[PDB]
Amino acid sequence: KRDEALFELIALEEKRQREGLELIASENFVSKQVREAVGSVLTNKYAEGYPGARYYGGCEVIDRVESLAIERAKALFGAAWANVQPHSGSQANMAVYMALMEPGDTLMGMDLAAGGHLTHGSRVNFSGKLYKVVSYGVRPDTELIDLEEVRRLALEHRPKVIVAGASAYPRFWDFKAFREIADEVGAYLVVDMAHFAGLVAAGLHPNPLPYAHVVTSTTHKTLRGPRGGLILSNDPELGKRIDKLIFPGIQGGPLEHVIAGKAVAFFEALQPEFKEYSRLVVENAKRLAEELARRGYRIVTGGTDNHLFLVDLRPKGLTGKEAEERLDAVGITVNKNAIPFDPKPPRVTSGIRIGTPAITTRGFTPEEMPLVAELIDRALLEGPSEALREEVRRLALAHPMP
Amino acid sequence: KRDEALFELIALEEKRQREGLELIASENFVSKQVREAVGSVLTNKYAEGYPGARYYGGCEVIDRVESLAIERAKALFGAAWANVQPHSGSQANMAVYMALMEPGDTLMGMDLAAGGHLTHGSRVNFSGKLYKVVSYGVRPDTELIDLEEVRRLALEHRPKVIVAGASAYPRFWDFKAFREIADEVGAYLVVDMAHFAGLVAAGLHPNPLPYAHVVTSTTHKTLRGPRGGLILSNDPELGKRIDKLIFPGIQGGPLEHVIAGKAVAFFEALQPEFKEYSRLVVENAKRLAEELARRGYRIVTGGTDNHLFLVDLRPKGLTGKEAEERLDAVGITVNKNAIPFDPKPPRVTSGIRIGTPAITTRGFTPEEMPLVAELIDRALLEGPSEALREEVRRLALAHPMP
Ligand SMILES: Nc1nc2c(c(=O)[nH]1)N(C=O)[C@@H](CNc1ccc(C(=O)N[C@@H](CCC(=O)O)C(=O)O)cc1)CN2
Ligand SMILES: Cc1ncc(COP(=O)(O)O)c(/C=N/CC(=O)O)c1O
C-alpha cells in the first residue's frame, strides 16, 4: 500500500522548490545522480569500522564505495587523510573536539553574533556545555576580523583549540596568520570550511589544508553534495586518532548510501564544469551585491569575496525580521543576520544574509542579477502582493532545477 | 557526466544482496517507497528547529512531513511525545544522556559481552568516557539477567540513569521490574529498544513505553525503515528538555528526506501485514535456532524469544571471526559476536549472531529453516567450496527482494 499522504507532501515540496527563489546561503540543489545514490540499497548494510576492518560480514562492495569516497576527497582537496563517515557537520566537529580536547579545556571560535557557527562555541550547544568558550568577532570600524585582537585573546586565554571559519563571513580567511597565532600558544588550528568548501575545491578560495591541523566540512552547501559531514587533514597520525572518535567514539553504523552520494558529489566537483559553476556563484554574488547597493542598500564590508553577502537594511529603515517576512511572502527566502554595528537586538537585527549557490545551480547568470535585485527591492518597499508573487514564480519556473 | 564507476559498485551491492543469505540480526531490506522518500528533494531544505518553530523560512511543507512522522510514531507506540530528528541510534542515546546527566554522573547499563550496546557504557565510546559506568551482566548458568543482581548493583552504586535494552540479548525484558528498581534509587529508566522496536509495534514484545521514562530506538532494524534514530516518552515535559539537546545541543539541520522515509516506515508498520511479517520473523528465528541445536550447536540461553540468537562456537574450536569468514565465502552473511563471559576480544569473539528480519522480508518461511541450517553447518565443518556457494545462490535467488 502506497503512503499517498506522505507523497502528496513530497510533490508539494517539489512544487515549492521549483516556484521560488532560494537565496539562503547554505542551500543548494543536488543532482539526480546524487539522489539516486542516496536512495540506493546501500542503506541496508551495517558496516561499522573502516575499509578492510569491519565488524560485519558482507562488506566487500561497501569497502570499495567508502574507499572511493575517501580517495576522491583526498584528490579534490589535496589531503593526506579523510574520514567520510560523519553524519553531519555537527558530528564532524564533535569528533574533532573530543579527539583534541578533554572536558573543561578552552575552545576559541568566532562569536555567534559576528557570524560564527553554533558548533564554534554556543552555550546552548555541546561545545559550550563541555568546554570553556572564548569568542572573537569583527571590528565595528572595519567590519572585518582583527587578527591582533584574535592573537591578544589567544595569549590571554590559552585555548587548546582555535576554530577558523564561520557561517556569515563574506571575506577571505588568512589561514597562515591563524596558524601562526595557534603555534604561538601551542593550540591546534581547526578550520570549519563547511560554507566555502565548494569554492576551495574549485580553487577560488584559499585552501586551509596546509595550515590547519584538521579541517571539517559539510558535503552539502557550496560543495553541492548530500547532507553529511567530512573531515580532512595533512597528518595521517592525527587522522587515526580522529577515526577512533568517529567510531567507536560517537557514531555507530555509517550511512553508506549517503557516503555513496558523497562519492558522486566529489566526482562532480572534480569535473571542469564545477569550476565554471563556482566562478559564476562568486560573480553572481558580487553582481547582486552591487545591484542592491545601487538601489540604496549598504553592503557590509562593501562587497564579498565569496558566495554570500550581508545587507545592511538601515538606509531603508527595515529590520531583518521584517525583510525576511516580506520576502518569504513572495517566494524569496533569505535569513536575517546581525550587522557588525547593529542598533537592534539579535531576534530582530538590521540585516539579511543572501547567497547565490542555489540560484546559480538553476542557471541564473550575472546579467539576470539586476532583475533579482529589483524584485527584492520591490518586495521590501511595496510589500507582498499577488502580482509580485507571480513575477517571482515566472522567473523561477524559467530556470529549471537539476 | 554520469558517475559510472560508483553506480557499477551499487549494482554489485544489489547483486550481492540478492544472491546471498543476509543473516545479520541488525539488518533488513527497506521497501521501494522508503527509498523513494529518502532519495527525494527534501534533502535540499535546511530545517533547523522544530515544526512551527524553525530558524529559516520556506519550511511550511517540511513541517507537515515532520509532524506526520511525529504523530505516526506516537500512534504506533502509544507515546505522548516523539522526536524523529536523531541521525542514528547513537545520537538518540547521546541526546538522552546529556539531557538527564552531567558528565561524571553514574550510568548503569548492560555489559557488552553479555549483550549491551557500545553506547550503554563502553570505555571506547562516549558513554564510558563522559560518565562513570556500572555494568550488569547475565548469570553464568542460565545466561539470563538476574533482576536481584541488577537491584543490588543499583542500590550499591546509585546510578542516575539505568539503561535496559541490548544489541544481542535473545530473551524478553521485564520493564516493570526495571522501573521498580530505578524508582528504588531515584534513577531514570531509559529503554533502548532499537533491536526489538518492530516486535513492540506488532505486539509481540513487551512495550517499554508505560514503564520507561524515555525510550530510544533506531528506525532500521525490526522496524524495517530508513537508517536513523528516534526518541519517545510518555512525559512531554521530559520531551521538551530532550528536544533542546537534539537541537541545538548535539545536531544541526535534520535529514528531512530521511524523516520522510521514517513517516513511510511508520505507515507500513501500522498495516495488518506488518504484524504477520513480525510473527514470521520470530517463528523463523526460533525454528532456525532449534535446527542448529539439533546439529549440535550451542545456542546461548538455549533459544530465543525474539528475532536473534547467539551461537557459542567454543565447543567447535572456531572463533567468531573464523566462522564469519567461512560463511561469508559462501554468501551467508553474519557477524562475529561477543558471547556472555567471552574470553576473546570484540575483534575476534567466540560466537556468531544470527537474525531473521532480513530473510523474512524476502519471504523465507519456517519450513525453509532446515535447509538454511544445513548450509550453515556445512560451511562451518567442511569449509567454503564452490558447490556450496552455488546452492546458497540458488536458494537466495528463488526469493524476491523488495
Ligand atoms: N553485544 C554487542 N554486540 C554487538 C555490538 C554491540 O555493541 N554489542 N555491535 C554494535 O554495533 C557490533 C560490534 N561492534 C563493536 C565494535 C567495537 C567494539 C570494541 O570494543 N572495540 C574496541 C576493541 C577491539 C578489540 O580489541 O577487539 C576498540 O575499537 O578499541 C565492540 C563491538 C555487533 N555486535
Ligand atoms: C541497542 C542499540 N542501540 C543503539 C545502536 C546504534 O544505532 P546506530 O548504529 O548508531 O544507528 C544499536 C545498533 N547496533 C548494531 C548491531 O547490533 O549490529 C543497538 O543495537
Curated annotation (Swiss-Prot), chains A, B:
The modification N6-(pyridoxal phosphate)lysine is found at K221. It is found in: Cytoplasm. InterPro entries: PyrdxlP-dep_Trfase, PyrdxlP-dep_Trfase_major, PyrdxlP-dep_Trfase_small, Ser_HO-MeTrfase, Ser_HO-MeTrfase-like, Ser_HO-MeTrfase_PLP_BS, SHMT-like_dom. Pathway: One-carbon metabolism; tetrahydrofolate interconversion; Amino-acid biosynthesis; glycine biosynthesis; glycine from L-serine: step 1/1. Its EC number is 2.1.2.1. Pfam families: SHMT. GO terms for biological process: glycine biosynthetic process from serine; tetrahydrofolate interconversion. The keyword Transmembrane does not apply. Coiled coil: none annotated. The record marks H220 as: Plays an important role in substrate specificity. Keywords: Amino-acid biosynthesis, Cytoplasm, One-carbon metabolism, Pyridoxal phosphate, Transferase. Its main location: cytoplasm. GO terms for molecular function: glycine hydroxymethyltransferase activity; pyridoxal phosphate binding. Pyridoxal 5'-phosphate binds at Y46, G89, S90, S167, H195, H220, G253. (6S)-5,6,7,8-tetrahydrofolate binds at L112, G116, H117, L118, E237. Belongs to the SHMT family. Homodimer. NCBIfam families: PRK00011.1. Catalyzes the reversible interconversion of serine and glycine with tetrahydrofolate (THF) serving as the one-carbon carrier. This reaction serves as the major source of one-carbon groups required for the biosynthesis of purines, thymidylate, methionine, and other important biomolecules. Also exhibits THF-independent aldolase activity toward beta-hydroxyamino acids, producing glycine and aldehydes, via a retro-aldol mechanism. PANTHER family: SERINE HYDROXYMETHYLTRANSFERASE, SERINE HYDROXYMETHYLTRANSFERASE 1. This is Serine hydroxymethyltransferase. It comes from Thermus thermophilus (strain ATCC 27634 / DSM 579 / HB8).
